[PDB]
Amino acid sequence: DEIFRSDTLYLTQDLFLPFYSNVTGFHTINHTFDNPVIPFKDGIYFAATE
Amino acid sequence: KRFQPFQQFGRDVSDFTDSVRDPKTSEILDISPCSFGGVSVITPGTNASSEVAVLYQDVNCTAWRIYSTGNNVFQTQAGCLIGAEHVDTSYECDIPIGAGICASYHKSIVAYTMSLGADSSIAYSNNTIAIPTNFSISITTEVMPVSMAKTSVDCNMYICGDSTECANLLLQYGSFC
Amino acid sequence: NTLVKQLSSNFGAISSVLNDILSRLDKVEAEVQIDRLITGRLQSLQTYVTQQLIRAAEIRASANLAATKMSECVLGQSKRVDFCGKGYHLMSFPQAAPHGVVFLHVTYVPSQERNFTTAPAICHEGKAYFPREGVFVFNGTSWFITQRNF
Amino acid sequence: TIAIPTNFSISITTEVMPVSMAKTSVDCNMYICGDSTECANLLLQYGSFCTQLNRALSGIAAEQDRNTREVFAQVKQMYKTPTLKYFGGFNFSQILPDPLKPTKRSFIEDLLFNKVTLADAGFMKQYGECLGDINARDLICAQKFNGLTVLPPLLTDDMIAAYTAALVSGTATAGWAALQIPFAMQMAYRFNGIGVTQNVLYENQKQIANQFNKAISQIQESLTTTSTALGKLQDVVNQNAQALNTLVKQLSSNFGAISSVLNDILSRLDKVEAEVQIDRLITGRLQSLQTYVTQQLIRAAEIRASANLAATKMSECVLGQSKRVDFCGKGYHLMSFPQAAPHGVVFLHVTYVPSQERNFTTAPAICHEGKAYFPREGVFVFNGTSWFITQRNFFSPQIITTDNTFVS
Ligand SMILES: *[C@@H]1O[C@H](CO)[C@@H](O)[C@H](O)[C@H]1NC(C)=O
Ligand SMILES: *[C@@H]1O[C@H](CO)[C@@H](O)[C@H](O)[C@H]1NC(C)=O
Ligand SMILES: *[C@@H]1O[C@H](CO)[C@@H](O)[C@H](O)[C@H]1NC(C)=O
């Protein structure tokens, strides 16, 4: 949220990425170029290491 | 407190808004309640007198946070006391103020330190012993409760009176009777 | 009397008087307010019952101790200290009282203590003659053997 | 065959018992409706369940003061410390106050107080102090701002220490309104009460004193190190704090309303619409207060049961010798000493423990010349040379005589 909080523990229900869940990897190099259409499925987490 | 740009208000665990960013100057401010502190009232009974004494637990009067200052403001262990005269003598604690302080009505309200009991010294002697030579017969009383009054409740009487519609609503509610 | 007085209170309803609601409101609209009142009044009854149970437990603890006193003090002599009176206990008598019992304890109280020189044992002729449950006291003329009391 | 002991030991054991709990008060208009005037009027046009709750709480507080009075105020006359601390080889230091140390409490009492951690050293918190320390999330400030208060006990800790010192001084001299007897002499009387003969005490006095002082030192060494011995008088403390902080936290909860924050509702809703939500919140918060009060009453009953048993122990064990089994210590009971502790009392019981049992052949009666000479409260044992008459405890053989036995 946009509320400020300090030194406390706060519980919330929301769409999150569960801990120790599977993530798919796509690697782009000269040999292989990957750009498939990926489903959205109620939101996504996207990480780029480059 | 340090506020991020997208924040405007701050809340505590009880969800009471305790911080606010000033719109014009962007300065963080803390919001605190105004009412705070404990109060107690000592009286000897309306029939005896109309005067009372007032004790403030969270004030040290050697001041500002008191309703009035009638006379004799003096600091005790229990807190700041207003309306009582202090007496050095020890007594038997008619009214317990607290922290070893008691009050009584002597004609004014007086406050004193609590008296534990009579003071005596017993000698220790290796070669001496005391034995009684007389005796007395004392009769003492002890009062102890045994039973209390037995009661019953008609819940349809207490709830819904003689009304038939409320009784049906009570029915289409639940049987906690 | 507190239960009686609590009927005056509204519990979020427009009125505490049921007859007014039924007089000037139709069934569906009256249902809401009557349900609010029902909830509040049931809650009051439950609070009363809980407090009665706690008081009853206290009274039970008091009654058991009184029964123990009757068995121990009235029908016997008790050697427990301060159970059946402050002094040494001799006898006790019960009297009935409204919702309770009053015990009269009769006790022995020593008085007029006098100081003597005391010996634990007597060398006599280089032997040890121990008192056998009494105190050796020196009256001024010769040594004597006495009880702790009287 | 029958076995009889030939030796004995002096053991000192401790028992910890709670006496009172913290006294509290609630400002219901503070906890419910804050400083808002409209919510106060709605509270008014609801009901007065605040008078009942506070009547119950005040009763509890008075009961706590009464509990302490009944445990510690048995002694009528106060008895000055003898200044000698030594009686017949027994060291009563570390149980009595030391003039050199400024504090009026004893060494063991100091250890006990140090062990138990207490939430509040003092009962005053000033408004300016709460304001200045806003950065720290002080729990007491949060309790106070929401209408919850803790009240000080009537009897200060130094007073309880004085009562305990008077009781110990009375035990040391005059025994259990004064008898005036030498320590060693009285100790001889306790042995008789047990059943052992006086000469046993007088002959072996130095060994018994060494053992006693020694047990005291072990108690001290056991308390110096950290243990869960005083756990009960800690559980009691944590329970109270936990209940108050739980009441503080419960204000965050909605009770079917749109928000838990009253100021938001009043800011963005008109009177009639705000009334519904405020009534829901009022109902919920009153319910929380009632639950807290009920739990406090149940805890108070438990503490009352504990205080009465402690008072009975003080009367029976400290001011007398008890023949009840295991009431004032595991072994045969001789004496007991009280020490004050935070919200409770610690009893030190001194007991006689038999040891080194030896087996002899036993006879119930002696035919002698076709007659029956019964022991008269002793056992007939065969040592190997001739028959002897002895006690149940601490084997001491005596020649059989007509006086020792009774004919039948
Ligand atoms: C609002 O007006 C005041 C006075 O002109 C000014 O100091 C302040 O900066 C203004 N607000 C902002 C955040 O610019
Ligand atoms: C009251 O204030 C005075 C002066 O600051 C201080 O010396 C005294 O200790 C205070 N009393 C208490 C018990 O806080
Ligand atoms: C009593 O104990 C103290 C401290 O342990 C010791 O100094 C003293 O010698 C002992 N007895 C006496 C009075 O000698």
Chain C residues interacting with chain D (CB cutoff of 8 angstroms): 2, 6, 8-12, 40, 47, 50-51, 54, 57-58, 61, 79-83, 113, 115, 118, 120-121, 128, 130-131, 133, 148
H/E element holding C30? helix C27-69
Determine which residue's CA is closest to atom 12 belonging to ligand 3.
Answer: D86
CB contact under 8 A, B32 and D131: yes
B63: nearest CA partner in chain D: D126
* D282-288 LR contacts (CB < 8 Å, sep 24+): D282/D32, D282/D33, D282/D39, D282/D42, D282/D43, D282/D46, D283/C11, D283/C12, D283/D255, D284/D253, D284/D255, D285/D31, D285/D32, D285/D250, D285/D251, D285/D255, D286/D28, D286/D32, D286/D49, D288/D247, D288/D250
Give the residues across from D360 on adjacent strands.
D2
Q: Which residue of A has its CA nearest to B9?
A: A3
Alpha-carbon dihedral sign for residues D356, D360, D364, D368: negative
Nearest CA in chain B to C45: B155
The DSSP symbol for C125 reads T
Burial class (CB in 10 A: 0-12, 13-18, 19+), B81: buried
For chain C, say whether B154 makes contact (Cβ under 8 Å): no
Identify which of D343, D243, D238, D289 has the alpha carbon closest to the alpha carbon of residue D56. Answer: D289
Q: For a substitution probing ligand 3, which of D83, D84, D90, D91 has the most ligand atoms within 8 Å of its CB?
A: D91
Q: How far is D61 from chain B (nearest CA, A)?
A: 12
Q: Which ligand is nearest to the CA of B23?
A: 1
Answer yes or no: do D202 and C2 touch at CB < 8 A: no
The enclosing H or E element of B101 equals strand B101-105
3-class DSSP state for residue B39?
strand
Q: Token pair of D337, please?
A: 């000493």
Tell me the C-alpha distance between D207 and D13, whole Å. 19
Rg for chain C (alpha carbons), in Å? 35
Partner-chain contact B122 D180, CB within 8 Å: yes
What is the distance in angstroms between the Cα of C56 and the nearest Cα belonging to chain B? 8
Instruction: Please tell me the total number of residues recorded for chain C in this structure.
Output: 150
Smallest Cβ–Cβ distance between C10 and the set D45, D297, D323 belongs to D45
Considering Cα of D319, then D175, then C133, then B132, what sign does the dihedral take? Answer: negative
Which residues lie closer than 8 Å to D205 by C-beta, 6 or more apart?
Answer: D88, D89, D184
CA-angle at D245, arms to D240 and D250, nearest 5°? 130
Q: Is B169 strand, coil or helix?
A: helix
Strand order of the β-sheet with B17-21 is B9-11, B17-21, B28-30
User: Encoding tokens for residue A50?
Assistant: 């480059």
Give the Å distance between the CA of D202 and the centre of ligand 3: 22
C-alpha span between D75 and B116 (Å, rounded): 10
Note whether A4 contacts B6, CB cutoff 8 Å: no
User: Which residues in chain D precede a discontinuity of more than 2.5 Å between C and N?
Assistant: 176
Which residue's alpha carbon is at the smallest distance from atom 11 of ligand 3?
D91
- Determine the distance from the C-alpha atom of residue B25 to the mean position of all C-alpha atoms in its chain, rounded to a whole number: 45
The answer to whether C84 touches C68, Cβ cutoff 8 Å, is: no
Q: Does D157 touch chain B (CB under 8 A)?
A: no
Pick B130's closest partner by Cβ from C22, C52, C113: C113
Radius of gyration from C-alpha coordinates of chain D: 31
Task: Name chain B contacts of C104, Cβ cutoff 8 Å.
Answer: 139-141
Contacts of D23 (CB under 8 A, 6+ apart): D60, D61, D64, D65, D150, D151, D152, D153
Are the C-beta atoms of residues D316 and D327 closer than 8 Å to each other? Answer: yes
Residue B37 to residue D123: CA distance in whole angstroms: 11
CB pairs under 8 A between A and B: 20
Instruction: Indicate which technique resolved this structure.
Output: cryo-EM
* Residue D339 near residue D352, CB atoms below 8 Å: no
B8: Cβ–Cβ under 8 A, 6 or more apart, which residues? A2, B20, B21
CB D19 within 8 Å of CB D136: no
3-state secondary structure chain D: CEEEEEEEEEEEEEEEEECCCCEEEECHHHHCCCCCHHHHHHHHCCCCCHHHHHHHHHHHHHHHHHHHHHHHCCCCEEECCCCCCEECCEECCCCCCCCCCCCCCCHHHHHHHHHCCCCCCCCCCCHHHHHHCCCCCCHHHHHHHCCEEEECCCCCHHHHHHHHHHHHHHHHCCCCCCCCCCHHHHHHHHHHHHCCCHHHHHHCHHHHHHHHHHHHHHHHHHHHCCCCCCCHHHHHHHHHHHHHHHHHHHHHCCCCCCCCCHHHHHHHCCHHHHHHHHHHHHHHHHHHHHHHHHHHHHHHHHHHHHHHHHHHHHHHHHCCCCCCCCCCCCCEEEEEEEEEECCEEEEEEEEEEEEEEEEEEEECCECCCCCCEECCCCEEEECCCCEEEECCCCCCCECCCCCCCEEC
Residues of A in contact with B29 (CB under 8 A): none
Question: Do B43 and B52 meet the contact criterion of CB atoms below 8 Å apart?
Answer: yes
Residue of D204, D201, D181 lying closest to D191 (CA atoms): D201
Q: Do A3 and B11 touch (CB under 8 A)?
A: yes
Contact call for residues B108 and B85 (beta carbons, < 8 A): yes
CA distance B117 to B92: 9
Q: What share of chain B is helix, strand, coil (3-state, %, to 5)?
A: 5, 35, 60
| Size of chain B in residues | 177
Rg value, chain B, Cα: 31
Cα distance between residue D87 and residue D49, in whole Å? 61
Distances (CA, A) of B147 to D63, D96, D302: 20, 45, 20
Distance from CA of D47 to the nearest CA of C (A): 5
Give the one of C57, C79, C81 whose C-beta lies nearest to D315's C-beta.
C81
- What is the helix (H) or strand (E) element at residue C137, kind and residue range? strand C135-138
Spacing, Cα D110 to ligand 3 middle (Å): 19
Helix axes D157-172, D107-115, angle to 10 degrees: 140
Q: How many CB atoms are located within 10 Å of the residue B65 CB? A: 14
Within 8 A by CB and 6+ apart from D316, the residues are C80, C81, C82, D322, D324, D327, D328
**Which candidate from A3, A6, A8 shows the least CB-CB separation from B9?**
A3
DSSP character at residue B127: T
B10 and A4 within 8 Å at the Cβ level: the answer is yes
Token pair 């410390």: residue: D81
Which residue, among D228, D247, D236, has the nearest Cα to D32 in the 3D structure? D247
Q: What is the structure's resolution, reported in angstroms to one decimal?
A: 2.5
CB D104 within 8 A of CB D215: no
Map tokens 């220490």 to a residue. D161
D29: phi then psi, degrees, rounded to nearest 5 = -65, -25
The answer to whether the CB atoms of D248 and B13 lie below 8 A apart is yes
Q: Within 13 A of D57's CA, how many CA atoms are on the CB side?
A: 22
Chains that touch D (3 or more CB pairs under 8 A): B, C
Backbone angles phi, psi at D9, to 5 degrees: -135, 155
Residues A21, A15: Cα–Cα separation, whole Å:
14
How far, in whole angstroms, is CA D224 from its chain's centroid?
Answer: 19
Give the closest of B141, B158, B163 to C41, CB-based.
Answer: B158
| Separation between Cα atoms, residue C63 and residue C100, nearest integer Å | 9
**For residue D392, how far is the Cα from the chain centroid?**
35
The answer to whether B65 faces chain D, any CB pair under 8 Å, is yes
**Residue C7: CB atoms within 10 Å:** 15
Compute the distance between CA of residue D142 and CA of residue D152 in angstroms, rounded to an integer.
19
Q: Are B18 and B12 in contact (CB under 8 A)?
A: yes
Helix (H) or strand (E) segment spanning residue B170: helix B164-171
What sign results for the dihedral spanned by CA atoms D161, D164, D168, D174? positive
Between the CA of D231 and the centroid of ligand 3 the distance, in Å, is 32
> Phi and psi at residue D257, in whole multiples of 5°?
-85, 165
Task: Give strand pairing partners of B110.
Answer: B85, B104
What is the number of the ligand 3 atom nearest to the C-alpha of D85?
A: 13
CA dihedral over C110, D337, D6, D86, signed as positive or negative? negative
CB contact at 8 A, D205 and D184: yes
**Residue contact B133–C56, C-beta within 8 A:** no
Identify the three-state secondary structure at position A21: coil
If one counts every other C-beta atom within 10 angstroms of the C-beta of residue D218, the result is 11
D180:B33 CB<8 A = no
Return the half-sphere exposure (C-beta side, CA atoms, 13 A cut-off) of residue D352: 26
Residues B12, B15: Cα–Cα separation, whole Å = 5
Q: How far is the C-alpha of D229 from the C-alpha of D16, rounded, in Å?
A: 8
> What residues pair up with C115 in beta bridges, in sequence order?
B130
Determine contact, residues B135/C108, Cβ cutoff 8 Å.
yes
Secondary element (H or E) of residue B157:
helix B155-158
Nearest to D119 by CA among D21, D15, D226, D19: D21
Q: Contact D25/D383 with Cβ under 8 angstroms?
A: no
Q: Report chain B's terminal Cα–Cα distance, integer Å.
A: 55
The residue in chain A having the minimum alpha-carbon distance to the alpha carbon of residue B5 is A2
Residue D110, token pair as written in the block: 């100091």
Cα distances from D405 to residues D61, D379, D384, in angstroms, run 62, 11, 21
Which contacts of C112-115 are long-range, i.e. CB under 8 A and separated by 24 or more positions?
C112/B132, C112/B133, C112/B134, C113/B130, C113/B131, C113/B132, C113/B133, C113/D178, C113/D179, C113/D180, C114/B130, C114/B131, C114/B132, C114/B133, C115/B128, C115/B129, C115/B130, C115/D180
CA distance D183 to D166: 16
| Ligand 3 centroid, distance to D169 Cα (angstroms) | 17
The single residue listed with the structure tokens 């040592």 is D383
Residue C41's H or E segment, with its range, is helix C27-69
Cβ–Cβ of C133/D197 closer than 8 Å? no
Closest CA to C58 of B55, B26, D173, D60: D60
* Touch criterion met for C and A (3+ Cβ pairs within 8 Å): no
Give the residues after which the backbone of chain B is interrupted, taking a C-to-next-N distance over 2.5 angstroms as a break: 62, 106
C125: Cα separation from own chain's centroid: 58
CA–CA distance from A1 to each of A14, A44, B18, C95 (Å)? 11, 19, 17, 73
Q: Dig out the tokens for D81 from the structure.
A: 């410390």
Q: How far apart are CA B77 and CA D294, in angstroms?
A: 31
Tokens read off for D133: 């320390």
Please state, in angstroms and rounded to a whole number, the distance separating the CA atoms of residues B52 and B50.
7
Q: Which 3 state secondary structure label does DSSP give C114?
A: strand
Taking the CA atoms of chain A, what radius of gyration do you get in angstroms? 17
Would you tell me how many other CB atoms lie within 10 Å of the CB of residue D16? Answer: 16
Which ligand lies nearest the alpha carbon of D107?
3
Pocket test for ligand 3, best of D83, D86, D219 (most atoms within 8 A of CB): D86
Check contact A-B (3+ Cβ pairs < 8 Å).
Answer: yes
Mutual angle of helices D50-72 and D157-172, in 10-degree steps? 30
B127: nearest Cα among C110, C139, D172, C115: C115
Task: Please list, in sequence order, all residues whose beta carbon lies within 8 angstroms of the beta carbon of residue D403, skipping any fewer than 6 positions away.
Answer: none
- Interface check C107 vs B, CB under 8 A: yes
DSSP C7: G
As a whole number of angstroms, the distance between CA C85 and CA C107 comes to 7
Hey, what are D237's tokens? Answer: 């403390």
Cβ contact D265:D258 at 8 Å: yes
- 3-state SS assignment for residue B31: coil
CA C38 distance to own-chain centroid: 40
Residue nearest to atom 14 of ligand 3 (CA): D86
Could you give the CA distance from residue D125 to residue D119 in angstroms, rounded to a whole number?
Answer: 13
Nearest CA in chain D to B129: D181
